Structure 1
């Protein structure tokens, strides 16, 4: 009944945002392990759910083009383009950050030449939290599958485009219920299903629901990180993910065995005393010390560069 818009097909439905490709490369951001809800349904055209609406995004060298599927079919409003502005955190100059990091790190300088426009998305805490609980012992394709199925089974239907049905992220009450783990195991999550249901239940009962996640957004990083590590299936790595990508702590540097490999190979880093909680914490401090208060954003450039 309706298709994904392209820029040639429906140009009166697309608004634009002035935005160079050195501030943003959609293809290095949207499927690079931050959000798992964006898919290149047409060449250079990216579709996904933001906040109970669907968007398609594409860009020139100078412009970022946006169309929104909500209702009388319009182009994006001013309020809706503001939410994309915030989502991409576009008030922060990535050009100036790239330079700032480059001046202390020769290796970064080399990689950055090739991989411009990698930035950090500003995600909803709830979507971010349950996405990263699903990320243990997993890959980007399977996580994308688990998150899609989870939204289909538990969150409200928004719209269909071609043969793709889009659902909003579920609320906590919907993932907390007595049959949720069992349903989630049927959807392929394995053990991760226990953690999803258990963490939803814990945010409601032990922390007072989603206002908690907003409190953590305003709390200091270290306070947020500790509070997150109390949740089932959430340890240091996942907590740093959420901190970096959804709670406005740009200094958070997620460290797993993969980042360890890269630090060692490309920086010559060794713990000053193989991986452990102590050593991984030391490596996050190392990078914070080197790159400064946006160390997690610098990690993202290298992270995407490593996925290639």
Structure 2
């Protein structure tokens, strides 16, 4: 009934935010392992849900164009001012990525080379709940599969928003919905495997042990180290997952997730080995050590630099 807008099709309905290609490349940010809720339905047109609404996003060399689908039986209008603010905060556009790129570059030549080809990789400020349960799905997984699991989980447990072409859009579930006695069984049906148990258990744990989603808000203002430790008490959440959530949803720019990719990057590209470890390969200690290494080199926005390299290590 209703269709995925392009900018050519329905230019009336779009609005714009002044934003150079160099501060944000949508195609590098939206499907490079931060959010799993965005897809390029038509070329250069990214559609996804954001806080119980659907958006299509596209950009020129100096403009970010965006349009909103309210969902309900609505008078299709342009994005409001508040909705444009919501998108501004989402891309943390107050932060100048140009100055961060040069600041990291001045101590790190490897970064300088990569950053040539990979500009406009910045961090989304994601909802905590959505980031938590998406990253619980990330264990022993690739982006594409995580994307699939998260989509079905939202269709199965989350409120229906709107349909566009053959795609139905659902909001992220509340904790209560994931915590119930049939939730693990349903989630296995949806292909999550062992992650089904961690999803239900962490949903149940945040409700009963931590008092629901205001807890995640507390962790947003809590210092990084405290947030990381508290996340790590949850079923299915270790250092990597906890660091991804810290970086991506709890405003801890210094959080450096250490997975197989950044372990490999460190060794291959930086010649780093664990010093204070005698054991040669990965471990909790060595991984924590590697995180410290990157903070020391890049500074309090080490997490963001790390995202530039992670994103670049996907594209051959």
Both structures adopt the same fold (TM-score exceeding 0.5): yes
Partner of 1:141: 144
Following TM superposition, where does structure 1 have runs of at least 4 consecutive aligned residues deviating by more than 3 angstroms?
Answer: none
Q: 3-state DSSP class of the match of 1:66?
A: strand
Q: How many residues align?
A: 308
Name the CA distance, whole Å, in 1 between partners of 2:93 and 2:133: 25
Structure 1 unmatched runs, 5+: none
- Aligned-CA RMSD value: 0.4
Superposed CA deviations along residues 88-114 of structure 1, whole A, max 9, x for unmatched, are 000000000000000000000000011
Cα pair 2:261 2:310 within 8 Å, conserved: no
Q: 3-state DSSP class of the match of 1:85?
A: helix
Superposed CA deviations along residues 132-160 of structure 1, whole A, max 9, x for unmatched, are 00000011111000000000000000000
Partner of 1:35: 35
Superposed CA deviations along residues 170-219 of structure 1, whole A, max 9, x for unmatched, are 00000000000000000000000000000000000000000000000000
Partner of 1:287: 294
- The one of 205, 210, 213 equivalent to 1:210 is 213
Name the CA distance, whole Å, in 1 between partners of 2:217 and 2:310: 27
Superposed CA deviations along residues 269-302 of structure 1, whole A, max 9, x for unmatched, are 0000311000000000000000000000000111
Name the CA distance, whole Å, in 2 between partners of 1:243 and 1:49: 21
What is the TM-score when the length of structure 2 is the normalising length? Answer: 0.97
Superposed CA deviations along residues 211-255 of structure 1, whole A, max 9, x for unmatched, are 000000000000000000000000000000000000000000000
Name the CA distance, whole Å, in 1 between partners of 2:210 and 2:96: 35
Name the CA distance, whole Å, in 2 between partners of 1:259 and 1:289: 15
Name the CA distance, whole Å, in 1 between partners of 2:259 and 2:37: 23
Cα pair 2:128 2:249 within 8 Å, conserved: yes
Name the CA distance, whole Å, in 1 between partners of 2:308 and 2:216: 26
Name the CA distance, whole Å, in 2 between partners of 1:141 and 1:118: 19
Q: 3-state DSSP class of the match of 1:217?
A: helix
